[PDB]
């Protein structure tokens, strides 16, 4: 048969956070111990409204009282002595090191972004996330797919053409569609005991410091092998999937000589397999054709938080060190570093 299957096994060096759109707020979790409890807040409200206490809950939510210890809905339940914790939702244990602040102030996390999930209650990694990470490798390592794929100044000129890849029905022409012929399937959904909720940590050049950010996305625990399939249907696509194991290294070599250099070696990790940069935290130089988006990306940021010159910030996190998967102290990962190996089946 023409359908030459594959088997991708992926590995988490740095934590990976993927989409889900929604996020909890400062008053949507419980923190009784090393577990953060994330309940179904509709059912929390439905149990708590029985005491006629919800009007008190109307006062607590707009209450910008200081000393964040008493702002995070644990003090609401430690105050009005609601003592069940029998609500729905999921409850994940702590990263243990994303609370740079003083002990017992700790637990004052603010805005947590959910991981993508299917409806049974487990998480997974979508096939479309891996497929969009694969497409950047295949677009930045094929040297015919970097030069003319730009704006040509049609509108205000920021936009790409998006036609330089075989795309579409295209009247009269035989059906080409290279990326129809690369069919990445979804991952086998794992369990919530590999999620740690890292905090974002920005490590800039020209002010050599690691100022953290108040954005605490959920993520994947490091050293987790994840199953995937790439079942092609054209031998032209079979060439690209066979050369993934070399094009990933070539992409990383044209990356590390370009952006990871001018940032010190201790913040960088090793590879141990072939390298890939999965979504949400890797920055806009793994989501882009970066060798042509150096002068077009920085035009968009004419706002209060412009990029510092070009190639402005490197994104790190804080996870438990599991190995040693680092090469430095204080556990600064890369937030999106992952490593895969491929094989025909």
């Amino acid at each position: 048969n023409d359908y030459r299957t594959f088997k991708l096994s992926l590995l988490t060096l740095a934590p990976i956070h993927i989409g889900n759109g929604e996020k909890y707020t400062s008053r949507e979790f419980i923190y009784e111990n090393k577990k953060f409890y994330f309940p179904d807040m509709g059912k929390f409200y439905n149990k708590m409204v029985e005491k006629r206490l919800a009007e008190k809950f109307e006062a607590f939510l707009i209450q910008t009282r200081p000393n964040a210890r008493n702002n995070r809905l644990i003090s609401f339940l430690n105050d009005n002595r609601i003592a069940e914790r029998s609500f729905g939702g999921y409850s994940i244990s702590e990263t243990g090191l994303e609370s740079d602040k003083n002990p017992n102030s700790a637990g004052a996390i603010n805005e947590v972004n959910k991981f993508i999930r299917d409806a049974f209650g487990n998480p997974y990694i979508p096939g479309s996330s891996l497929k969009g990470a694969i497409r950047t490798i295949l677009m930045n390592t094929t040297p015919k797919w970097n030069n003319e794929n730009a704006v040509n100044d049609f509108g205000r000129f920021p936009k790409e053409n998006k036609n330089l890849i075989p795309w579409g029905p295209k009247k009269g022409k035989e059906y080409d569609d290279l990326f129809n012929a690369i069919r990445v399937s979804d991952s086998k959904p794992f369990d919530n005991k590999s999620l740690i909720l890292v905090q974002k940590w920005d490590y800039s050049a020209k002010t050599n410091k690691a100022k953290p950010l108040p954005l605490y996305r959920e993520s994947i625990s490091p050293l987790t092998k994840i199953e995937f399939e790439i079942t092609t249907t054209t031998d032209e696509a079979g060439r690209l999937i066979e050369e993934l194991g070399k094009r990933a290294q070539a992409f990383y070599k044209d990356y590390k000589a370009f952006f990871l250099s001018e940032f010190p070696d201790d913040k960088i990790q090793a590879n141990l397999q072939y390298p890939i940069y999965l979504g949400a935290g890797s920055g806009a130089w793994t989501k882009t054709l970066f060798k042509q988006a150096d002068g077009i990306l920085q035009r968009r940021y004419s706002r209060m938080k412009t990029k510092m010159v070009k190639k402005g910030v490197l994104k790190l996190t804080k996870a438990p060190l599991k190995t040693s998967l680092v090469k430095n102290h204080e556990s600064f990962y890369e937030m999106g570093k992952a490593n895969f190996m491929i094989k025909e089946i």
């Binding site: 048969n1 359908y3 989409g19 889900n20 759109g21 993508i116 299917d118 409806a119 049974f120 209650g121 979508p126 096939g127 479309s128 497929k131 969009g132 950047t136 677009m139 794929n149 730009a150 704006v151 920021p158 936009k159 790409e160 998006k162 990326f179 129809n180 012929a181 690369i182 069919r183 990445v184 399937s185 979804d186 959904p189 079942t231 806009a284 989501k287 882009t288 054709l289 042509q292 988006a293 077009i296 990306l297 035009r299 968009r300």
Partner: protein, 217 residues
């Protein structure tokens, strides 16, 4: 003579599917690409057209020698099962598919399911200026199963052509375990498992004791 038999397969979903439908009054910030669902039960259907016209292309790249370029050009190993409409003697079907209604609307509520579809958020990262373009495509969830009935006709025009055709029905029903079953496809959305391929006659008298062995192979 005239008989008619029936395949009671069960499409189990594996990383479930999204058969699209178009709605002009959807929302602003909600579903803009919904699964096609039944109007009165609001369960997602796998309609029979997306099964039939998927098996048609699967077996049309396989059971053809001349490159087809159209239906009404298949090599009559297909067109006596799926029907042409330009050949004279093969206008009618001989295969009657069905819509695949969702069986386990209660073995899904046994698990922690609060809606029989799941809405996936799916941005489009512009490779220059890094900007997104979100969407919300709806899809039916993983552990669904769908009662898939398929009906095969038998007249006195099948001199020796009955048991040949189950090398076409089993070929389609384990090439759909290779293909995606309509959907985004190259982003997941397809893989399925036709459990319990259990043929039985429903009109006429026919021996299917010889038939149930080339289905469990």
């Amino acid at each position: 003579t005239f008989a008619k038999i029936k395949f009671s397969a069960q499409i189990r979903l594996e990383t479930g599917l999204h058969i699209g439908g178009s709605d002009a009054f959807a929302a602003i910030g909600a579903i803009n690409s919904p699964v096609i669902k039944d109007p009165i039960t609001n369960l997602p259907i796998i309609p029979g057209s997306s099964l039939k016209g998927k098996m048609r292309t699967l077996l049309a790249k396989v059971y053809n020698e001349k490159v087809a370029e159209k239906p009404s050009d298949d090599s009559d190993i297909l067109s006596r099962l799926f029907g042409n409409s330009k050949d004279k003697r093969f206008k009618m079907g001989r295969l009657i598919f069905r819509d695949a209604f969702l069986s386990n609307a209660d073995e899904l509520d046994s698990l922690g399911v609060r809606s029989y579809t799941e809405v996936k958020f799916e941005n489009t990262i512009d490779r220059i200026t890094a900007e997104a373009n979100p969407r919300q495509i709806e899809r039916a969830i993983r552990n669904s199963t769908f009662d898939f009935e398929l009906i095969y006709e038998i007249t006195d025009e099948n001199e020796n052509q009955v048991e040949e055709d189950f090398k076409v029905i089993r070929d389609g029903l384990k090439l759909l375990e290779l293909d995606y079953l309509g959907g985004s496809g190259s982003r997941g959305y397809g893989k399925v498992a036709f459990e319990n391929l259990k043929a039985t006659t429903v009109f006429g008298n026919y021996d299917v004791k010889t038939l149930n062995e080339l289905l469990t192979a």
